[PDB]
Design a protein around this ligand. Structure first.
Ligand SMILES: CC(C)(C)NC(=O)[C@@H](c1cccnc1)N(C(=O)c1ccco1)c1ccc(C(C)(C)C)cc1
Ligand SMILES: CC(C)(C)NC(=O)[C@@H](c1cccnc1)N(C(=O)c1ccco1)c1ccc(C(C)(C)C)cc1
Lengths: 306, 306
C-alpha cells in the first residue's frame, strides 16, 4: 500500500555522468560508449549570451579546447561535432559502465526521472512530467546544465531529456538526446517565456484509478458522461481535452477496478464542479497530474483492495 | 529554482541489494563487506505468524538453510547470527561494491531515501520522513521487506531503515540496521496499529523558509509570537510543540532570509488559524512536513531571491 512520487533507481545513469569544461564554463556531460554528450552552450562566451552563432563559436575550438573529467580521471577528447543543440565529444575511452540504452523523444504528459548533477557529481533524483507547454517543473540550480532525464525498462536506460536552461517563471527547458529542444525554446538569452500550461487530464484519471486500487472510492458517483460533454466542462477548468486514444490507454486500469473510463470521467467532472469538500485523495488535496497510467500499473498492486 | 521531493542518488545502495530465501519465503538483503543483513521474519513459518519464537525457529536452521543471490551469483552462507530483529548472515565473499557506510538511528521528523526492492532487484526510489508515531508513509508491496532507507553525505552511506511490515492503515514499520524497531512494533501478526500522528512543525517551518528563499513572501505577516503562545495554537491543530532546540536549528535559514524564527512562527500560526485562502506555497495547498531544515539548505540556492 501507499503511493509516492517514485523515481527509477539512478545507479546506471550515475556511472555515466562526467564534467565538461570549455574555458571558464563548466557543466555536466553524459558518457556513453566513447561519446560524451553535453549542451552546446558550454562554448558560449560570457560577453554575449544574447546573439551567439554556435557554428561560428564552434570552428574556433579544437579537441583539446574541451576538458572532460570522469571522477579523478581526465578523458582525452579526440573528436567533436555539433548535433542540433548538443555537442557530441569523441573521447579516447569507452565508458566501461555504459548500460544498455536508447534515445527516445517523450511526449507531453509523459513522466521521467531526473538525476540532478553539479560538476559531474550526482546530487539528487526526482520524478517529473513533461508539461503540455514543453517545460518541466524541475529543481535545478546554476551549473545543473547537462543533467539528464530518463526512464528504465528491463535494465535498458531510455534517455529522454538533457537540461539546458531556466525560464523567468523558474521552470526548466531542455532537449532530447538528439539535441532538439522540447518546445519553442532556444539556447540563448531572449524574452522567451513558458506558454500557458494545462492540466494533464489523462494523468489525473490514472491517479484516481490508483486511489481506487489502493482502496478509496469516495469520489465516485452514479453518473456517466459522453466524451464531448466531459470536454466542455474539463476545458473550462484548463484541463486538456480527453480523446478516445486516452480512453483506450486507461483500459487496463478500468478492467482492474471495474470502473468504466467515462464513469471515472463523470467522477472527475463532479470533483472539478464541486471542489474537494475538504477531503484528500492519496494524501492530496490538489488533483495530481504527474503520474501516467503506466506509472500507476508499475507502482500499484495488481489486485485491488476490493 | 523549483522545489521537489528529492531523494539521494541510489547507485551505492543498489550495488548492495541481494535476495535472501529461507524455505518458501523470499525477501531482500543488504550486502556490506562479508555480511548480508535481512529481516529475521524470513525464517517465520507460514503456519503461525501469530506466535513465532525466533530463537527457537533459528536453532533449527544451518548456514545452508539460507540461499543468498547477488544477481546471477550464489553467495555461500558460512555463518549466521540474530541481532535483535535482523539476521546477520556471514558470506564467503566481501561485496566489492561496498561503499563507505555507517549505521545510524534516525529520530522522528528526520527524512531519508528509500530504495524499494523486490527479489533483490531495485524498482524505485522515493523520499520519506520518519513520522512522530514511528511509522513511515511508504509505497511498498508484498516482498518489499529488507528494502532500506538511507542518507548520503560526502560519499558515505548512512543506513537508517530496513523495511519489515505493513500496518492495517497501509503505513509501514521497520528497524534500524541494529534490528531495533522504530516505534512499539513487533515482527509478528498482532492487533498492533499505528499510534495517533502529529504534524512535524519544524519541517513545516523549514519549508516556509524554502518558499521565501525561492522568492515567495505572501504568507508572512507583521506579527511575532512567544514560543508558548505558538504552542497553545499549534497543539490545537495537531502540530508538535516547538522547543527552543527547534528554534536554534532554524538559525541558518533565518539568517539567509532575514526572517526571525518567531516571526515565521507567527506566519504559520496565521496560516493555521485562517486557512490558505485558496493559494499555494511551492505548488502545494497542504503545509508540507517531510522536508527538514537540512533538506532545504541542501536543495535551495544559498542566495535568496531577495
Ligand atoms: C536564468 C538564466 C539566465 C537563463 N539562467 C540559467 O538558465 C542557468 C540555470 C539556472 C538554474 C537551472 N538551470 C539553469 N544557467 C546555468 O546554470 C549554466 C550555464 C552554464 C552552466 O550553468 C544558464 C544556462 C544557459 C545559459 C545560456 C544558454 C544563456 C548561455 C545561461 C545560464
Ligand atoms: C499486512 C501484513 C499481513 C502485515 N503484510 C505485510 O506486512 C507484508 C507487506 C506488504 C506490503 C508492504 N510491506 C510488507 N509482508 C510481506 O510482504 C512479506 C513477508 C515476507 C516477505 O514479504 C509481510 C511482512 C511480515 C510478515 C510477518 C512478520 C507477520 C511474518 C508477514 C507479511
Amino acid at each position: 500500500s501507499g503511493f509516492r512520487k517514485m523515481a527509477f533507481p539512478s545507479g546506471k545513469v550515475e556511472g555515466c555522468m562526467v564534467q565538461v569544461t570549455c574555458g571558464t564554463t563548466t557543466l555536466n556531460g553524459l558518457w556513453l560508449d566513447d561519446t560524451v554528450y553535453c549542451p552546446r552552450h558550454v562554448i558560449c562566451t560570457a560577453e554575449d549570451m544574447l546573439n551567439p552563432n554556435y557554428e561560428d563559436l564552434l570552428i574556433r575550438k579544437s579537441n583539446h579546447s574541451f576538458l572532460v573529467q570522469a571522477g579523478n580521471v581526465q578523458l582525452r577528447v579526440i573528436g567533436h561535432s555539433m548535433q542540433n543543440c548538443l555537442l557530441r565529444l569523441k573521447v579516447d575511452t569507452s565508458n566501461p559502465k555504459t548500460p544498455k540504452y536508447k534515445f527516445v523523444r517523450i511526449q507531453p504528459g509523459q513522466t521521467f526521472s531526473v538525476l540532478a548533477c553539479y560538476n559531474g557529481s550526482p546530487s539528487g533524483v526526482y520524478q517529473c512530467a513533461m508539461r503540455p507547454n514543453h517545460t518541466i517543473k524541475g529543481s535545478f540550480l546554476n551549473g545543473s546544465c547537462g543533467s539528464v532525464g530518463f526512464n528504465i525498462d528491463y535494465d535498458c536506460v531510455s534517455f529522454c531529456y538533457m537540461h539546458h536552461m531556466e525560464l523567468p517563471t523558474g521552470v526548466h527547458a531542455g532537449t532530447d538526446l538528439e539535441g532538439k529542444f522540447y518546445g519553442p525554446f532556444v539556447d540563448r538569452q531572449t524574452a522567451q517565456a513558458a506558454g500557458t500550461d494545462t492540466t494533464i487530464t489523462l494523468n489525473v484519471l490514472a491517479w484516481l484509478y490508483a486511489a481506487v486500487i489502493n482502496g478509496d472510492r469516495w469520489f465516485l458517483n452514479r453518473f456517466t458522461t459522453t466524451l464531448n460533454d466531459f470536454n466542455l466542462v474539463a476545458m473550462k477548468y484548463n484541463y486538456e481535452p480527453l480523446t478516445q486514444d486516452h480512453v483506450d490507454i486507461l483500459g487496463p486500469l478500468s478492467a482492474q477496478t471495474g470502473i468504466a473510463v467515462l464513469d471515472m470521467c463523470a467522477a472527475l467532472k463532479e470533483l472539478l464542479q464541486n471542489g474537494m469538500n475538504g477531503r484528500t485523495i492519496l494524501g492530496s488535496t490538489i488533483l495530481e497530474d504527474e503520474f501516467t497510467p503506466f506509472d500507476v500499473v508499475r507502482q500499484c498492486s495488481g489486485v485491488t483492495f476490493q
